């Protein structure tokens, strides 16, 4: 049902960021595996975009999977930032890798008996690369990573400056505050194409989606959505080639001849990957 589901609106203290992170939550039951649904570049501070734009909770109720939707961190790339995250609205502390990989799972285990290990992270847009970086560096916790419509080589060429533009347009943040000048090693570290050997060695299950910029009847037929999806598509194709070349063998690659940078297409993927998540994480 949409109303009447056991959906919580948690307030999870983050020592590292000095505030309470709101977290929308639906348990799949005691000791259930978690699915972290990471929001896109323009993440709002009231509700995660996955809740706003999809019936995700509804789709995953009684799936044996806990659904975890952190709220906030627009333009954060769910990263630990070098300096305060200062945008149009003011400064906030961004230490999202710390939060997602310790404070949150520990709180969820202690307070809701959510299994802290063997989780998936699924992100769209900005959070698509973040999902893979979470699995790259925290494979115990994240054994599955979904990346929807993300720029997958952000440290390369125009990469850093395109990221700067977007953060600027979304809340007016500056990429220097996050991973520093493009010279800083933080860029390579958070580039999922660069971290492909990790993904392979950890045998991380991947779900990699990117549309082609052509809208079908689902909608999203507008130029920005079309131009954005097409623009990030090649990094998705190059990721695929590199991953296979590095001996990758645990990914689903989803590059249909349709799809724009719009929630209609992302929802469709989240819905599509439920049974795969259940098998890969042992929901049964």
Ligand X SMILES: OC[C@H]1O[C@H](O[C@H]2O[C@H](CO)[C@@H](O)[C@H](O)[C@H]2O)[C@H](O)[C@@H](O)[C@@H]1O
CB 39, min distance to ligand X, A: 6
Q: Does 115 bind ligand X (CB under 6 A)?
A: no
CB 160, min distance to ligand X, A: 9
Rounded to whole angstroms, how far apart are CA atoms 37 and 39? 7
Query: 4 Cβ partners below 8 Å, 6+ apart?
Result: none
Q: Does 225 bind ligand X (CB under 6 A)?
A: yes
Q: Does 158 bind ligand X (CB under 6 A)?
A: yes
Exposure class string for 69-80: b at 16+ Cβ within 10 A, else e:
bbbbbbbbbbbb
Stretch touching ligand X by CB under 6 A, among 115-123, 156-164, 176-184, 272-280 = 156-164
Query: 146 Cβ partners below 8 Å, 6+ apart?
Result: 120, 121, 122, 123, 128, 131, 206, 207, 208, 209, 269, 273
The residues that are catalytic are 125, 229, 261
142 is written with which tokens? 């994240």
Stretch touching ligand X by CB under 6 A, among 54-62, 129-137, 154-162, 271-279 = 154-162
Query: 8 Cβ partners below 8 Å, 6+ apart?
Result: 23, 24, 25, 26
Q: What's the full length of the chain, in residues?
A: 284
CA dist list (Å): 241 to 81, 247, 269? 30, 10, 21
Q: Does 261 bind ligand X (CB under 6 A)?
A: yes
Among 12, 67, 151, 281, binds ligand X (CB under 6 A): 151
12 is written with which tokens? 């999870």
Among 24, 101, 119, 125, binds ligand X (CB under 6 A): 125
* Per-residue x/- track, 31-70, ligand X (CB under 6 A): ---------xxx------x---------------------
65 appears as a binding residue in the annotation: no
125 appears as a binding residue in the annotation: yes
Q: Which residue number has the CB closest to ligand X?
A: 40
- Asked whether the beta carbons of 178 and 82 are under 8 A apart, the reply is yes
Q: Note the residues at the interface with ligand X (CB under 6 A).
A: 40-42, 49, 125-126, 151, 153, 157-159, 162, 220, 224-225, 228, 230-231, 234-235, 238, 261-262
Residue ranges at the known binding site for substrate? 41-42, 125, 153, 231-234, 238, 261-263
């Amino acid at each position: 049902s949409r109303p009447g589901l056991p959906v919580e609106y948690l307030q999870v203290p983050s020592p590292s960021m000095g505030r309470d992170i709101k977290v929308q939550f639906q348990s799949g039951g005691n000791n259930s595996p978690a699915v972290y649904l990471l929001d896109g570049l323009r993440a709002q501070d009231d509700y995660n975009g996955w809740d706003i734009n999809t019936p995700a909770f509804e789709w995953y109720y009684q799936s044996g999977l806990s659904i975890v939707m952190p709220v906030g961190g627009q333009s954060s790339f769910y990263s630990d930032w070098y300096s305060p995250a200062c945008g149009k609205a003011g400064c906030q502390t961004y230490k999202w890798e710390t939060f997602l990989t310790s404070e949150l799972p520990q709180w969820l285990s202690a307070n809701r008996a959510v299994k802290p290990t063997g989780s998936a992270a699924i992100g769209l847009s900005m959070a698509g690369s973040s999902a893979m970086i979470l699995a790259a560096y925290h494979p115990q916790q994240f054994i599955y990573a979904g990346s929807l419509s993300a720029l997958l080589d952000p440290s390369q060429g125009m990469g850093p400056s395109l990221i700067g533009l977007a953060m600027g347009d979304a809340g007016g943040y500056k990429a220097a505050d996050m991973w520093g000048p493009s010279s800083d090693p933080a860029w390579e570290r958070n580039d999922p194409t660069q971290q492909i050997p990790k993904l392979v060695a950890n045998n991380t299950r991947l779900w990699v989606y990117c549309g082609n910029g052509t809208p079908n009847e689902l909608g999203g037929a507008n130029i920005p959505a079309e131009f954005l999806e097409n623009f990030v598509r090649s990094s998705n194709l190059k990721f695929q080639d590199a991953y296979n070349a590095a001996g990758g063998h645990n990914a689903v690659f989803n590059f249909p001849p349709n799809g724009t940078h719009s929630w209609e297409y992302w929802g469709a993927q989240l819905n599509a990957m439920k049974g795969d998540l259940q098998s890969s994480l042992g929901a049964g």
